């Protein structure tokens, strides 16, 4: 017997991604983490989006 998830891995979109989606037809997923880790200085993320 193995354990496997019963529900899908839901994934939501930030409104900054909505503004970039309207404007430049592009999404940088988990945009808030990219913004904070750019302006702070740490260049290595914990996880991906």
């Amino acid at each position: 017997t193995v354990s496997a998830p019963a529900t899908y891995g839901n994934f939501v979109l930030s409104p900054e991604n909505a503004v970039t989606a309207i404007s430049y037809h592009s999404i940088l997923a988990d945009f808030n983490s990219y913004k904070a880790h750019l302006t702070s200085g740490q260049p290595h993320l914990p996880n991906d989006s």
């Binding site: 503004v19 989606a21 309207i22 404007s23 430049y24 037809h25």
Partner: protein, 49 residues
Amino acid sequence: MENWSALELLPKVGIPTDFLTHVKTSAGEEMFEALRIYYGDDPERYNIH
């Protein structure tokens, strides 16, 4: 070319733009750089890539 969905969907600022000649004259005599007129109401704003 310059995407006009970024004009149509993004929130704009209300303003009393009172220019002296007719709008279609200032279009058809090319006083502006790049026009984009539609005489209907086209759904090309909605194909958000």
